[PDB]
RNA sequence: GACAAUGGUAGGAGAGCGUUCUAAGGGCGUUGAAGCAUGAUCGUAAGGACAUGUGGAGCGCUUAGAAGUGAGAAUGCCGGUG
RNA sequence: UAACUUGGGAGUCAGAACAUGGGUGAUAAGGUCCGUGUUCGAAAGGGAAACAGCCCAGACCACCAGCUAAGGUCCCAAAAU
RNA sequence: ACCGAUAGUGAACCAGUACCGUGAGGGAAAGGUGAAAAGCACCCCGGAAGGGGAGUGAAAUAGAACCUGAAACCGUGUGCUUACAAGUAGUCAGAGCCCGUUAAUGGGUGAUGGCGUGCCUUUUGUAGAAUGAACCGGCGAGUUACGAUUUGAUGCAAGGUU
């Protein structure tokens, strides 16, 4: 029974910054959902969280491939009879680019009490700057 | 209508979270020296002393 | 040392008594005698006696001055119940319960 | 002779209630309900012994992949190299050898690479 | 100085004075055993190779033979009058490592 | 010796009581199968 | 010691545990029996022990024999409490 | 590695889907009535998102051990961005 | 090699009675203080009932609602845990925190992850929105007499047996 598990006491976490310039929405989202989850460090510890905080920058520059800016609809419901709304992925990005990236990455993390706490490590901002200079966020390069 | 399921000891004891009587809220009288109801007379000896 | 007092087979139902016992459990002697005398409930003139006679054993059997006493234990238990019936409509009957309780109070000097 | 049941029914309805303590509500109190839950618990345990040997293997494989990716080589590639090299160390030891010591692990990555 | 032995169809990480539990051997209590199949000698000492290192035996003393904690193997099939109940205690041997 | 007796070997056997649980092999239905005329009490057919 | 075998309903075959009573032998009990309560104990299972309380006069063990011999379900019968 | 023979004890007589030959219906029906196989009934485990009957495979018990089957390797979710 | 108070007579308890019916008629429930009443003088709280002491006794947690006193159910105190969460409520993995046993890979609690649609009847097929059970305790269903046929055992054997 020689197996090592990691507890809150022995876990540390880093801060990274990813740039969305010239990146596909689904080719960037997949790689960020493996950092938040902590599948790059040797002590995986599925019961405990070991992931790292990431900061997206320039999230407007995100790019879609083929006729999607007018042929991809995001639907929602408000529980009232007949109330079902929709907005095209083009207009969403010219309106609220933080939401676009942030609702694609979260559809790749599990839906449990623990995947809800790993979705709070994602900070998204359209501008080339970010207000988190108080830490030491080092850059991470997507492969 | 009739009840479909029995009620457990847990769900019964939550309902009575609020089934309690409050403190009468009394004060000492500056004659009798005995607790009396506010804005009433001292029963032990009647002196309202408005 | 603690003096106790019991009233066995009082005729008020047990979960009507329990509403009052809460208001006094933890209070002080003179405060407890006053609450049971300014409350509108029906179990007050009986519970008060069980308390006015726990303080007569706290000083006549043992020797404690009745000023520094607290109420430590106050609970109401069950007693044997009486079976009764009340005739309903269209030739049918239903049962009735005349419930009973035991009341118990322990006063102590915190030593 | 007349043989009435005595103390033989009570003696085996308490062997079943003691096996159910910590169960919620009435499942640790009443016999009819605690007997069904004691039965289901055994069936789950038999199934859960088998899956414990599957769960832990997919834990050692994630750890080893995350250690190997640092040296620009996939878990699949590394495993194929080790077989050629005839090292024969199972998944559990490689994960422990990696977590405890980084240097020993490198001495393996290199051999697998040489094997190709 | 840790090594990787191969005793009971399994492998075990071993350190000096570590208490390790393995499958039932024939050696008597209070005797001294030895392991002839060592796979990996490393850590502080020189990293070595495989299938098996040359020489490199590991020695230990036997402390107790025993029987593990009891379990109960119950199963059934619903709506069909079919149940079964069995017990089990797996035996073991406890050793202490004293020379790698 | 009236306190250590043993009959011949092979001779006595224990009778079979049906309807005494599931692990005997003769439990619920007691060796009759399911509904019919040979499953009711009072029996099924004439000797002919 | 070697090899082979071991999912199971209706159903057929084999070996076992426990309960009350009796015969013979051998024992424990006011220096506390049965039974009731708690425990982290031993058997492949049905099950068997040993300590500690509560109680206050009866009860086990070995080998045979005889059965009102085992309960979770019948809109089952009776009592108690929700 | 089975066969037949004489004696003791039985249960069963409401079957279902899938593939392939045909009636009947309309080259309709998870329709129905026959021939020929298998699986369910009486069969757990892995895949088909969930899904008795479909593809793989027949559980004596224990294990933080190895090599494979159908099906698979961007993330949820183990293994090729 | 019959029962031991749900048993044995309907009936161990003033029972063919309390009661139910115009009538013929039906028909229950209910045993146990101690060896001996030695069945709690007197004192205190209270209108009493009921208590707290002091005494009787081997024992009053033996006080006439009297041996023992199980489970449902109702309470009082407390060691770990719970107010962003979608739960056949368990089972395997697992930190943190509190105790110390019929001493052995100990006991209690459980943040968080994986798997996971009660039991019984009846059916080709039931998580089933098909049936049954409010819960706990007691009682509640292949037997015997005589004949027939086949297996095992024992005795004698061209005899065997009343």
Swiss-Prot record, chain C:
InterPro entries: Ribosomal_uL22 (IPR001063), Ribosomal_uL22_bac/chlpt-type (IPR005727), Ribosomal_uL22_bac/org-type (IPR047867), Ribosomal_uL22_CS (IPR018260), Ribosomal_uL22_sf (IPR036394). The gene is rplV. GO terms for biological process: translation. GO terms for molecular function: rRNA binding; structural constituent of ribosome. Belongs to the universal ribosomal protein uL22 family. Keywords: Ribonucleoprotein, Ribosomal protein, RNA-binding, rRNA-binding. SUPFAM superfamilies: Ribosomal protein L22. HAMAP family: Ribosomal_uL22_B. The keyword RNA-binding applies. This is Large ribosomal subunit protein uL22. Gene3D superfamilies: Ribosomal protein L22/L17 (3.90.470.10). Part of the 50S ribosomal subunit. This protein binds specifically to 23S rRNA; its binding is stimulated by other ribosomal proteins, e.g. L4, L17, and L20. It is important during the early stages of 50S assembly. It makes multiple contacts with different domains of the 23S rRNA in the assembled 50S subunit and ribosome. One of its GO terms (cellular component) is cytosolic large ribosomal subunit.
């Amino acid at each position: 029974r020689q197996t090592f598990m990691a507890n809150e006491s022995n876990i540390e976490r880093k801060w990274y910054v990813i740039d969305a310039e010239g990146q596909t929405l689904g080719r960037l989202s997949s790689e960020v959902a493996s950092i938040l989850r902590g599948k790059n460090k040797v002590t995986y510890t599925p019961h405990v969280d070991t992931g790292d905080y990431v900061i997206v920058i320039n999230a407007s520059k995100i790019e879609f491939t083929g006729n999607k800016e007018t042929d991809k609809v995001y639907y929602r419901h408000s529980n009232h009879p007949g109330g079902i709304k929709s907005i095209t992925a083009g207009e969403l990005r010219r309106t609220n680019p933080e939401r676009l990236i942030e609702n694609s990455i979260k559809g790749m993390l599990p839906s449990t009490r623990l995947g809800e706490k790993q979705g709070k490590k994602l900070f998204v901002y359209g501008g080339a700057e970010h207000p988190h200079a108080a830490q030491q966020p080092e850059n991470y390069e997507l492969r | 209508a009739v009840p479909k399921r029995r009620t457990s000891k847990t769900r019964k004891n939550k309902r009575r979270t609020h089934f309690k009587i409050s403190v009468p809220g009394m004060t000492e009288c500056p004659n009798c020296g005995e607790y009396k109801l506010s804005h009433r007379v001292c029963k032990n000896c009647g002196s309202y002393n408005g | 040392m603690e003096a106790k007092a019991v009233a066995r087979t009082i005729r008020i139902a047990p979960r009507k008594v329990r509403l009052v016992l809460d208001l006094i459990r933890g209070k002080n002697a003179a405060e407890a005698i006053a609450i049971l005398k300014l409350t509108n409930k029906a179990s007050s003139p009986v519970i008060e006696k069980v308390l006015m006679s726990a303080l007569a054993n706290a000083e006549h059997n043992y020797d404690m001055n009745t000023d520094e006493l607290v109420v430590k234990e106050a609970y109401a238990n069950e007693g044997p119940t009486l079976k009764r019936f009340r005739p309903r409509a269209q030739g049918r009957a239903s049962a009735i319960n005349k419930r009973t309780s035991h009341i118990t109070i322990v006063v102590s000097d915190a030593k | 002779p007349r043989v009435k049941g005595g103390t033989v029914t009570r003696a085996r309805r308490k062997k079943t209630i003691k096996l159910a303590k910590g169960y919620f509500g009435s499942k640790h109190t009443l016999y009819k309900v605690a007997k069904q839950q004691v039965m289901k618990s055994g069936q789950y345990a038999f199934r859960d012994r088998r899956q414990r040997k599957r769960d832990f293997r997919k834990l050692w494989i994630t750890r080893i992949n995350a250690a190997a990716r640092q040296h620009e080589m996939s878990y699949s590639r590394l495993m194929n190299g080790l077989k050629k090299a005839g090292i024969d160390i199972n998944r559990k030891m490689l994960s422990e050898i990696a977590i405890s010591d980084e240097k020993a692990f490198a001495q393996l990555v290199t051999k697998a690479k040489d094997a190709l | 100085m840790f090594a990787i032995i191969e005793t009971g169809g399994k492998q075990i990480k071993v350190e000096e004075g570590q208490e390790i539990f393995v499958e039932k051997l024939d050696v008597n209590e209070g005797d001294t055993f030895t392991f002839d199949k060592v796979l990996f000698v490393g850590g502080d000492s020189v990293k070595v190779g495989a299938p098996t290192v040359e020489g490199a035996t590991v020695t230990a003393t036997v402390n107790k033979q025993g029987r593990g904690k009891k379990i109960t193997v119950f199963t059934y099939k619903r709506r069909k009058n079919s149940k079964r109940k069995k017990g089990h205690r797996q035996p073991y041997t406890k050793l202490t490592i004293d020379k790698i | 010796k009236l306190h250590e007796l043993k009959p011949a070997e092979g001779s006595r056997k224990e009778r079979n009581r049906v309807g005494r649980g599931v692990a005997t092999g003769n439990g619920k239905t007691s060796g009759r199968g399911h509904k019919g005329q040979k499953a009711r009490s009072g029996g099924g057919v004439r000797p002919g």
